[PDB]
Design a protein around this ligand. Structure first.
Ligand SMILES: NC(=O)c1ccc[n+]([C@@H]2O[C@H](COP(=O)([O-])OP(=O)(O)OC[C@H]3O[C@@H](n4cnc5c(N)ncnc54)[C@H](OP(=O)(O)O)[C@@H]3O)[C@@H](O)[C@H]2O)c1
Ligand SMILES: NC(=O)c1ccc[n+]([C@@H]2O[C@H](COP(=O)([O-])OP(=O)(O)OC[C@H]3O[C@@H](n4cnc5c(N)ncnc54)[C@H](OP(=O)(O)O)[C@@H]3O)[C@@H](O)[C@H]2O)c1
Ligand SMILES: Nc1cc(C(=O)O)ccc1C(=O)O
Ligand code: NA
Lengths: 359, 357
């Protein structure tokens, strides 16, 4: 079996990494939980076992076979290259390594083939990108993709445990204390790192991550760039609007595509139904469509409201929902580790291709 | 001055109709509040005066100059034609008369000219359409519009007083009693009249109104058909996805357009800023963009996140927010009434074009 380390074990994604590993088929001989100095020495369960949390350091990875990182980009930048140097295979949930040509950016149902040539780091894409890829890959395979326009409806757990707590607190102040949403004080959302913070309670914030120099946010540009890499087609036009709404878990997306060939809607429904990891929930006569509250706790990606554009011959609209902590993060990561195991790819990488940041 | 009647005075829109009338310049000599039989006899304020609510009937409109209807499509279908026969000018918030070619479908900043030929009924468009029209008209004027794709983020007050209470109760049950959202009981949302009801707490429901034959909902199809009528151009391609989210007041919209000619983004921002009823809130360097919570209580429509598409030469994205009970309903109606006053259009219609009953 394997020694598996979870880096960022105490966070929103980490708690789901634990759950997904507890439910995994991976043969695990030893579990280690790593986080910051803040959590070092505390205890968390793995099944019935008590695991002492360790501070993440450059020397923490000896004997580790697989390390799952979900502790922020700076933590992956600082420590994943040392883990690789030590002989680990890293599955990274952060954005840091996603666009590195030496790093596979993987959704196992879409581009598992990319895992074979890994160099010790496999990156999980952005949560909003992953579920979109599950929905759209079966369509691309049969009718091609020319462009995508997507507007997202993103849950706050996307921004971490602090953001969940902020949202719950804000809602309680409004609903129990009678505070006006405009009078709420926020510390984290829309973006922990940015300069100004706004209430999410009873609001919709059209900012996820920070702004880039083209006036799209980093979240929007990640959807664009990650789609192109995952589908191995730079010619797919993708523009996004990413919005935070008052949902704790599960992202929803209004997705418009134009295909290369006309894709009959009944065939599109069938293709998605048949695609691993995607579930068709589309029966408007009985008001059946994906819903965030129904998707929570499931590894599947749910697709419905599928219909042709009213004017563009090759245009199709749909609604895509998945638990952003599961398929959008921890489940994609554990699924990657399981796929690495299936393919005999859990072993050290001889040549280091990633800069060491702590020399 | 005028005798003004508010039909549906007790509802979500009705309450805001009262507020907009209280704050109006309209010369009002007499105000009357009308609702259903179960509200008759109750008292409701107009400024400091106490107004006794009356039951809406076929005979209730004698001596009324202007009637603002916000009491459900059934109530407008039933009583609006009797109001017209009685010499009233009706401004209707319902969907009932919107697609009747004898009825102007008006956003005053966009198509006030359509008021001149009214036949006693003027229809207010759907809330989600109105704010989109305010944002897009200044762009259309300068560079034209080829197509629109919109995804909405609609507040629960759009579905009436009951939907607000249901939303608040559901959120309390989750936050205070630890109920899982998927286990909540719902009676109204997504659509009061439809067969099944779902929780909105911590959810996003991609259904507003009921489904039509083409698998778009009536709300989505209204955005399509109403846009074409208001902008007087059936060639504009419009497809919508309309979604309810856990917001009490103010609708937000992610709007994509392609113009007929390339519209430089700085000029687009300037054109929107200069357009009556639209306010530019777009300064990403300081994280400035329209927000539902900031728009509540304002008659203005706020536009930001304006940026060109990453690939389509003529494509532009933006974010549009307005209070759905104000510009989306009660303010659009009162603004129509003020515009009718300005234009000398508050008078009986000689020829009746609307079937009684
Ligand atoms: N949430 C999502 O839907 C989502 C989806 C895809 C990807 N991701 C990515 O996954 C990562 C984790 O996000 P989250 O939502 O789980 O955040 P979170 O709840 O705020 O948790 C952050 C975690 O990072 C750890 N950490 C912080 N600084 C550290 C350091 N210097 N060394 C080691 N550990 C450190 C924290 O440990 P302490 O408790 O000791 O502070 C905690 O375990 C982020 O990079 C995020 O971009 C998140
Ligand atoms: N809410 C919005 O953002 C929005 C936007 C645009 C248009 N609209 C339209 O405006 C209308 C009202 O919506 P709302 O949200 O204000 O609904 P609401 O809160 O449920 O209020 C319904 C109102 O209609 C009255 N009513 C019901 N049946 C009646 C009858 N038979 N005769 C006279 N009055 C009757 C009710 O009076 P009682 O109290 O006596 O029952 C109440 O005043 C609807 O047609 C809706 O489509 C709403
Ligand atoms: N800003 C984010 C970035 C990522 C990522 O790229 O890992 C995941 C979630 C969020 C969020 O805040 O919802
Ligand atoms: Na203006």
């Amino acid at each position: 079996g394997y020694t598996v380390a979870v880096v960022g074990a105490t966070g929103a994604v980490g708690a789901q990494m634990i759950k997904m590993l507890e439910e995994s088929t991976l043969p695990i001989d030893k579990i280690r939980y790593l986080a910051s100095a803040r959590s070092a020495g505390k205890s968390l369960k793995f099944k019935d076992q008590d695991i002492t949390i360790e501070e993440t350091t450059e020397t923490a990875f000896e004997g580790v076979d697989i390390a799952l990182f979900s502790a922020g980009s700076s933590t992956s930048a600082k420590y994943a290259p040392y883990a690789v140097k030590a002989g680990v295979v890293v599955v990274d949930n952060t954005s840091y390594f996603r666009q590195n040509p030496d790093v596979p950016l993987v959704v196992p149902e879409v581009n598992a083939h990319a895992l074979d040539a890994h160099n010790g780091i496999i990156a999980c894409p952005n949560c909003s990108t992953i579920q979109m890829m599950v929905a759209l890959e079966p369509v691309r395979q049969k009718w091609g993709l020319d462009r995508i326009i997507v507007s997202t409806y993103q849950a706050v757990s996307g921004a971490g445990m602090g953001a969940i707590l902020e949202t719950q607190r804000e809602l309680r102040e409004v609903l129990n204390d009678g505070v006006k949403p405009c009078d709420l004080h926020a510390e984290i959302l829309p973006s922990g790192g940015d300069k100004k913070h706004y209430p999410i309670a009873f609001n919709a914030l059209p900012q996820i991550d920070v702004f880039t120099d083209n006036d799209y946010t980093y979240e929007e540009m990640k959807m664009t760039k990650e789609t192109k890499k995952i589908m191995e087609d730079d010619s797919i036009a993708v523009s996004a609007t990413c919005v935070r709404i008052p949902v704790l878990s599960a992202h929803s997306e209004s997705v418009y595509i134009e295909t290369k060939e006309v894709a009959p809607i009944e065939e599109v429904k069938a293709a998605i139904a048949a695609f691993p990891g995607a579930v068709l929930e589309d029966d408007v006569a009985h008001q059946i469509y994906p819903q965030a509250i129904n998707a929570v706790g499931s590894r599947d990606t749910f697709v419905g409201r599928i219909r042709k554009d009213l004017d563009a011959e090759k245009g199709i609209h749909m609604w895509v929902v998945s638990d952003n902590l599961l398929k959008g993060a921890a489940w994609n990561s554990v699924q990657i580790a399981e796929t690495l195991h299936e393919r005999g790819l859990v072993r050290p990488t001889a040549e280091l291709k990633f800069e060491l940041k702590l020399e």
